[PDB]
């Protein structure tokens, strides 16, 4: 009666990709033959399999496909008695995610570069500062070769790329090549505030801490000059320049405002302080910079990035507001308000607060404005931003809706999360909703699929979702019901999950001061069967550079940035719900999601 | 592109090929031969043949203790900001605390905290910070430098002047109570240099040779060769004085076990003409160290240092006079017993 | 004053090491966690070492552990800060700084080993030594004037022992000495490839880099 095929919006080479094939209003067993071909040409058969479909499994089939590597499109075709579906889907060559660890962030001419490539046939390339290739080749993931830097070379930021054979997208890592000596001390800086007021009257301070690499305080003096960084260019304040003593490794540098006004009588830029510390003996010095102090009107910024831009008239709308500091770091415990809806909440640690908004039934368009309301801030120093959400278009003006509801906050693996199916529409159609179909999406692949019975009268249906580490760093929950074998009603929601390691890795030690040559004994606690890679670096190397290094947070960042879903959920209509969540859909009544323009989110 | 390349190097005995459908480095300055069947760039670095920022004048005059006097001037168009005068003490010397403390409280100045023992600032490296150095007239400061401990050989100290907007460009001067310039004394010919000691080594006399005590001298660690030589001619190359000499006899032989087949060069500064009273065609007793050797031509050359022993050896004409005769024997015994037995 | 024959000067200062890989083939506990004790010796550097461990597990993806620190120190020691490179025949001053971390007042002998490649205070016969005191929890700078006479890497070594005690230290660091001139850079030509051949004739050591590209 109605047949549906769901696949991820983009398909990856060489990895198990689960797909969904469903039969609505058909109580008859059948075998289904399913093929994938290159498109438009249909030259070679890329994958094939036959699967059993029965009332035993609720007429639902979840097979997996693998496309061996051989803009580029494919066609998933499925056929059997009564069934003929075909979806054209975009292909990506990024089979998995690659990350490059390097030995250190800075090298001298004529030294080696030790590196590892990790994966969540591969080749690795080395590029010069001028952007000229100098290495390329297949890499044995059990064995890497150090790369030898020539005695005469170009100085500056090189880059290393790791990729699959015929892919246009990559992971890139950096390292500097400089004629440098390691300094005997680190300098750490502490700003007075995380921001500077464009039109304020406060001074700006920087606390300098200078300590030798083995622990004692440094004695000496510091030279600090303040400036402004306009996109790329740095524009100094020549009368900032002050010399201050560093006594017992401590010192405080101060930029006066009337000195700042005198030179700047600014929007969208940052205050920087450049700091040069010298030992009392004159033996060596260190140069670091305090950056990212945005010149602003408000200490905060409001964002609507985590709210759906669509609503369901007559159902309560879930507004998820997000506040950060100017650098974009979450700002916790910040009260937010929307006057027009007399709504009010305060920000959790993740920087979010959930506000439920009651909306009229005849609204097609919904405009929202949110203000910070911080106890310690004058009105004109609060932050605000505006948005307007637009109503989900029902299929053929039917008035039938679906809403998925989550009240749980700061989601971590281990939890059991209530997920609500909230349904609304005409009494005639509602009495036909016999089940719900749901899809869990993680890392751009369809992770799990299940069914949720609805009995008659049940317009609120709650089920449980148990969260494992498989859902890190975030997952999408998408659901739909179908009415009388041709209307589809759908919703989706985006759920953040706490970004830890999927497993566990600790390096345990005694923590006592040691002696050159002393016997050391360290402990490694990890998962059974883990390959662990180690390195020891003189702390003096972090002093000089630390922005290129690998970290768990960077792993999860890049993986998120390559999510095929582009939206915080819901959509224009049935079609858009799937499109925005990174899905493809084709039915037997040609309900087809449009073609995906680019793999990287609009 | 459907290429197939091949490069020929006089360097490599077999040429290199690569299918362009890339780098190779040498250590030579030769013609390349390329064959195609794309763009190429070739790079060839070689070594091709003081104080732009400040004027620095550092003297140390005598207090009739020493007065350290420093004068500086920025050579820029505008007064330099936030300039630094980096000072090291002569060995066993220490700043008069009272003076240094007066300088420390100066309007536009700063110096770090220092401890004090009996009017002696407890710092060997002293750094004075100034807000500005003038670009138009010289700026000077002075203070007394106090002799704490007596010492053989004072190491000269140094003064560096540099400013905030020019840290990499450092102007350095040295100062010594004896050597005006404070530079360690050395000798160079063409481009190669060796240490000289500073103390100008005088010729030896030497009335009755204590032959046992002399063997002892010519047998210590640092004595590698012992020759009898002949002063053929005196010249002046890059290094002011060249004494050309010929090895007449070999009494003890250096690691280079082979002399006498090559004319030797002995080199000393014009400031040393007086004390080394070498005359042409006179015979000389010479021994020294092979750490004094200075490479050149096919010829073997050393430089005259305090490790070099120089004594005139009379001629046979001379070896009949009442004054010279008992010494000629002394020289004959010495040669004989050293050459026949070793140490 | 113990003999400098006794004190073996530290010299092993890598900027990174322990570049090893490692399987947790041990069995998990109640917690499902596997454990691997490992031994090594520290190198010579007085500093803190950060040890970073990153692991991969078939179903648990990749994981970057928290860094683990190792402070390595002494009670009394030398810190020699050297420039990247120095020019042949030019006179320079290097400043070793001595650290006293004991809460007493000490008296100290500092000697700079002779080397034939330099011109300095130290002569073959005797090393330029000096004796002087250091106050409680303090440090004292020590200048050395040398003159490089040879290009290349050439050790500078300094040794210091305290008096009436057993605390000493020695440091050996290689100094880089470079040719007297300014390195000059000729792009011998920029040619293209439209069987075609080409000869490119002859244009302080020398290097020559050969770059051919695709277009
Ligand atoms: Ca997350």
Torsion from C-alpha of B332, B333, B338, B340, nearest 10 degrees: 90
| A449 labeled binding residue | no
Contact C76, C136 (CB under 8 A): no
What is the domain extent for residue A454? 400-500
Strand order through the sheet with A506-508: A506-508, A519-526, C34-41
Contact C73 A215 (CB under 8 A): yes
Chain A residues within 8 A of B164 when measuring between CB atoms = 223, 241, 276
How far lies B194's CA from each of B239, B295, C143, in Å?
A: 12, 10, 21
Contact B163, B121 (CB under 8 A): no
| A497 labeled binding residue | yes
Sketch the domain layout of chain C as residue ranges.
Answer: 1-74, 75-179
The token duo for B214 is 């002399």
Report phi then psi at B320, rounded to 5: -130, -15
Helix (H, G, I), strand (E, B) or coil at C124: coil
For the domain covering B1-49, report its CATH number.
2.20.210.20
Same domain, yes or no: A36 and A6: yes
Indicate the CATH number of C75-179 among 3.40.50.10900, 2.60.40.10, 3.40.50.9100, 3.30.70.20. 2.60.40.10
The token duo for B257 is 């076990």
Instruction: Assess A99–C contact: CB distance below 8 Å, yes or no.
Output: yes
Torsion from C-alpha of C14, C15, C17, C19, nearest 10 degrees: -140
Query: What is B49-183's CATH topology?
Result: Immunoglobulin-like (2.60.40)
Contact A531, C21 (CB under 8 A): yes
**Residue A272 CB contacts under 8 Å (≥ 6 apart), including other chains:** A226, A227, A228, A229, A234, A289, A290, A291, A293
The token duo for A20 is 């969904």
> Which of A298, A316, A346 lies at the terminal end of a domain, its last residue?
A298
Same domain, yes or no: A430 and A476: yes
C-beta neighbour count of C177 within 10 angstroms: 20
Residues 72-91 of B with CB under 8 A from A: 81-82, 86
Helix (H, G, I), strand (E, B) or coil at A249: coil
Chain A residues within 8 A of B158 when measuring between CB atoms = none
Q: How far is the CA of A472 from the centre of ligand 1 (A)?
A: 6
Report phi then psi at C112, rounded to 5: -110, 110
Same domain, yes or no: A303 and A393: yes
Helix (H, G, I), strand (E, B) or coil at A534: strand
Contact C193 B47 (CB under 8 A): no
| C-alpha span between C105 and C135 (Å, rounded) | 5
Q: Indicate which CATH number applies to the domain containing A546.
A: 6.20.50.160
Same domain, yes or no: A206 and A294: yes
Candidates A150, A219, A285; nearest CB to B112:
A219
- A-B CB pairs within 8 A amount to 31
The answer to whether position A599 is within a domain reads no
C-beta neighbour count of B258 within 10 angstroms: 11
| C-alpha span between B264 and B266 (Å, rounded) | 7
CATH class of the domain at C1-74: mainly beta
Same domain, yes or no: A286 and A189: yes
The answer to whether position A602 is within a domain reads no
Q: Nearest 5 degrees, angle CA B299-CA C149-CA C208?
A: 90
Same domain, yes or no: A287 and A217: yes
Instruction: Assess B38–C contact: CB distance below 8 Å, yes or no.
Output: yes
- Residue of chain B minimizing CA distance to A220: B112
Signed CA dihedral, B157, B161, B167, B170: sign only? negative
The answer to whether position A329 is within a domain reads yes
The answer to whether position A601 is within a domain reads no
Method: X-ray
Which of B147, C84, B97 lies closest to A106, judged by CA? C84
Sketch the domain layout of chain B as residue ranges.
Answer: 1-49, 49-183, 184-343
Strand order through the sheet with B264-267: B300-303, B264-267, B242-252, B225-235, B283-288, B309-313
Q: How far is the CA of B103 from the centre of ligand 1 (A)?
A: 60
Same domain, yes or no: A15 and A77: yes
Chain B residues within 8 A of A276 when measuring between CB atoms = 164, 167
C-beta neighbour count of C202 within 10 angstroms: 11
Report the gap between the CA of B22 and the closest CA in chain A (Å): 6
What DSSP line would sit under B20-87, residue for residue? -----EES----EEEE---EEEEEEEEEE---SSEEEEEEEEE---EEEEEEEEE-SSS-EEEEEEEE
| C-alpha span between A569 and A591 (Å, rounded) | 19
Length of chain B: 343
Chain C residues within 8 A of B39 when measuring between CB atoms = 190-193, 212-213, 215
| C-alpha span between A384 and C52 (Å, rounded) | 42
- Residue of chain B minimizing CA distance to A245: B112
CATH class of the domain at B184-343: mainly beta
Contact C147 B122 (CB under 8 A): no
Report the gap between the CA of B156 and the closest CA in chain A (Å): 18
| A473 labeled binding residue | yes
Report phi then psi at B32, rounded to 5: -100, 145
C-beta neighbour count of A473 within 10 angstroms: 19
| Phi-psi region at A137: left, alpha or beta (left = phi > 0; alpha = psi -120 to 50) | left
Q: How far is the CA of A554 from the centre of ligand 1 (A)?
A: 11
Candidates B86, B129, B160; nearest CB to A243:
B129
Contact C124 B291 (CB under 8 A): yes
The token duo for C56 is 């991969």
Chain C residues within 8 A of B158 when measuring between CB atoms = 93, 143, 145
Report the gap between the CA of B323 and the closest CA in chain C (Å): 36
**Residue A30 CB contacts under 8 Å (≥ 6 apart), including other chains:** A53, A80, A81, A82, A83
Q: How far is the CA of C63 from the centre of ligand 1 (A)?
A: 15
The answer to whether position A240 is within a domain reads yes
Q: Indicate which CATH number applies to the domain containing A455.
A: 2.60.40.1930
| C-alpha span between B208 and B211 (Å, rounded) | 9
The answer to whether position A598 is within a domain reads no
């Amino acid at each position: 009666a109605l047949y549906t095929l769901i696949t991820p919006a983009v398909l990856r080479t060489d990895t198990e990709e689960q797909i969904l094939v469903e039969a609505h209003g058909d109580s008859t067993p059948k075998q289904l033959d399913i093929f994938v071909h290159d498109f438009p040409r249909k030259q070679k058969t890329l994958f094939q399999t036959r699967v059993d479909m029965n009332p035993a499994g609720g007429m639902l089939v979840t097979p997996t496909i693998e496309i061996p590597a051989k803009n580029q499109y494919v066609v998933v075709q499925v056929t059997g008695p009564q069934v003929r579906l075909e979806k054209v889907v975009l292909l990506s060559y990024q089979s998995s995610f690659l990350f490059i660890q390097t030995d250190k962030g800075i090298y001298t001419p004529g030294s080696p570069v030790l590196y590892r490539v990790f994966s969540m046939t591969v080749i690795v390339e080395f590029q010069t500062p001028e952007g000229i290739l100098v290495s390329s080749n297949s890499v044995d993931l059990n064995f890497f070769w150090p790369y030898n830097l020539p005695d005469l070379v170009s100085l500056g930021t090189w880059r290393i790329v790791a990729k699959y054979e015929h892919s246009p997208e990559n992971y890139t890592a950096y390292f500097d090549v400089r004629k440098y000596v390691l300094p005997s001390f680190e300098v750490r800086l502490q700003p007075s505030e995380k921001f500077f007021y464009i039109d304020g009257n406060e001074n700006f301070h920087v606390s300098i801490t200078a300590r030798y690499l083995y622990g004692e305080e440094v004695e000496g003096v510091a030279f600090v000059l303040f400036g402004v960084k306009i996109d790329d260019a740095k524009k100094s304040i020549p009368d900032s320049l002050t010399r201050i003593p560093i006594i017992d490794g401590d010192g405080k540098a101060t930029l006066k405002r009337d000195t700042f006004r005198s030179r700047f009588p600014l929007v969208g830029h940052t205050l920087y302080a450049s700091v040069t510390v010298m030992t009392e003996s004159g033996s060596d010095m260190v140069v670091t910079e305090q950056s990212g102090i945005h010149i602003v009107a408000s200490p905060y910024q409001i964002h609507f990035t985590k709210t759906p831009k669509y609503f369901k008239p007559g159902m309560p709308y879930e507004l998820t507001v997000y506040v950060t500091n100017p650098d974009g770091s979450p700002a916790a415990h910040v009260p937010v308000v929307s006057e027009a809806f007399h709504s009010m909440g305060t920000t959790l640690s993740d920087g979010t607060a959930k506000l439920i908004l009651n909306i009229p039934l005849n609204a097609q368009s919904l405009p929202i404005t949110v203000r910070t309301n911080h106890g310690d801030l004058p009105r004109e120093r609060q932050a605000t931003k505006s948005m307007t959400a637009i109503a989900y278009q029902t299929q053929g003006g039917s008035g039938n809706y679906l809403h998925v509801a989550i009240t749980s906050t700061e989601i971590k693996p281990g939890d059991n999360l209530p997920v609500n199916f909230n349904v609304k529409g005409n009494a005639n159609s509602l009495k036909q909703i016999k089940y719900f179909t749901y899809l869990i999406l993680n890392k751009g692949k369809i992770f799990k699929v299940g069914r949720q019975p609805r009995r008659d009268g049940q317009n609120l249906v709650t089920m449980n979702l148990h969260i494992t580490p498989d859902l890190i760093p975030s997952f999408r929950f998408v659901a739909y019901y179908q009415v009388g074998n041709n209307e589809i009603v759908a919703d989706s929601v985006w759920v953040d999950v706490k970004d830890t390691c999927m497993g566990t890795l600790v390096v345990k030690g005694d923590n006592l001061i040691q002696m050159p040559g002393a016997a050391m004994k360290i402990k490694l606690e990890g998962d059974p069967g883990a390959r662990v890679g180690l390195v020891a670096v003189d702390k003096a190397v972090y002093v000089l550079n630390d922005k290129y290094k690998i970290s768990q947070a960077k792993i999860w960042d890049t993986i998120e940035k390559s999510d095929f879903g582009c939206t915080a959920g819901s959509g224009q209509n049935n079609l858009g719900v799937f499109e925005d969540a990174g899905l493809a859909l084709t039915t037997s009544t040609n309900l087809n999601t449009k073609q995906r323009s680019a793999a990287k989110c609009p | 592109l459907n290429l197939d390349i091949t490069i020929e190097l006089p360097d490599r005995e077999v040429p290199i090929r690569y299918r362009i459908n890339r780098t190779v480095e040498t250590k030579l300055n030769q013609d390349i031969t390329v064959t195609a069947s794309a763009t190429m760039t070739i790079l060839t670095f070689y070594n091709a043949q003081v104080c732009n920022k400040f004027h620095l004048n550092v003297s140390v005059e005598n207090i009739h203790a020493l007065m350290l006097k420093i004068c500086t001037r920025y050579l820029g168009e505008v007064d330099s900001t936030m300039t630094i005068i980096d000072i090291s003490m002569l060995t066993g010397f220490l700043p008069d605390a009272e003076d240094l403390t007066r300088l420390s409280k100066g309007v536009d100045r700063y110096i770090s905290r220092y401890e004090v023992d009996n009017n002696m600032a407890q710092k060997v490296a002293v750094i004075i910070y100034l807000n500005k150095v003038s670009h138009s007239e010289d700026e000077c400061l002075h203070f007394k430098i106090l002799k704490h401990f007596e010492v053989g050989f004072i190491q000269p100290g140094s003064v560096k002047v540099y400013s905030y907007y020019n840290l990499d460009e450092k102007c350095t001067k040295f100062y010594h109570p004896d050597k005006g310039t404070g530079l360690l004394n050395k000798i160079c010919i063409g481009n190669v240099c060796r240490c000289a000691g500073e103390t100008c080594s005088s010729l030896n006399h030497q009335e009755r040779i204590d032959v046992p005590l002399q063997i002892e001298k010519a047998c210590e660690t640092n004595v590698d060769y012992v020759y009898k030589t002949k002063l053929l001619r005196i010249e002046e190359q890059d290094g002011n004085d060249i004494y050309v000499m010929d090895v007449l006899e070999v009494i003890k032989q250096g690691t280079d076990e082979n002399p006498r087949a090559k004319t030797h060069q002995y080199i000393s500064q014009r400031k040393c003409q007086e004390a080394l009273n070498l005359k042409v065609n006179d015979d000389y007793l010479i021994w020294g160290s092979r750490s004094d050797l200075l490479p050149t031509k096919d010829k073997i050359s050393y430089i005259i240092t305090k490790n070099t022993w120089i004594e005139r050896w009379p001629h046979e004409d001379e070896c009949q006079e009442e004054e010279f005769q008992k010494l000629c024997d002394d020289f004959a015994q010495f040669s004989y017993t050293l050459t026949e037995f070793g140490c | 004053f113990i003999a400098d024959s006794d004190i073996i000067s530290r010299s092993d200062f890598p900027k990174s090491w322990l570049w090893l890989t490692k399987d947790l083939t041990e069995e998990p506990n109640s917690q499902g966690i596997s454990s691997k004790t490992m031994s090594f010796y520290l190198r010579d550097s007085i500093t803190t070492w950060v040890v970073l461990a990153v692991s991969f597990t078939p179903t648990k993806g990749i994981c970057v552990a928290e860094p683990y620190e190792i402070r390595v120190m002494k009670v009394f020691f030398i810190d020699l800060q050297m420039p990247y490179s120095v020019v042949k025949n030019e006179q320079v001053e290097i400043r070793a700084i001595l650290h006293n971390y004991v809460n007493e007042d000490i008296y100290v002998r500092v000697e700079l080993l002779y080397n034939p490649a330099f011109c300095s205070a130290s002569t073959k016969g005797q090393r330029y030594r000096q004796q002087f005191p250091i106050k409680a929890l303090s440090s004292r700078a020590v200048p050395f004037v040398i003159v490089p006479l040879e290009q290349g890497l050439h050790d500078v070594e300094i040794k210091a022992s305290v008096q009436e005690a057993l605390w000493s230290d020695g440091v050996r660091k290689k100094l880089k000495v470079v040719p007297e001139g300014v390195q000059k850079s000729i792009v011998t030509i920029v040619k293209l490839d439209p069987t075609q051949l080409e000869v490119i004739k002859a244009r302080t050591e020398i290097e020559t880099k050969i770059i051919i590209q695709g277009d």
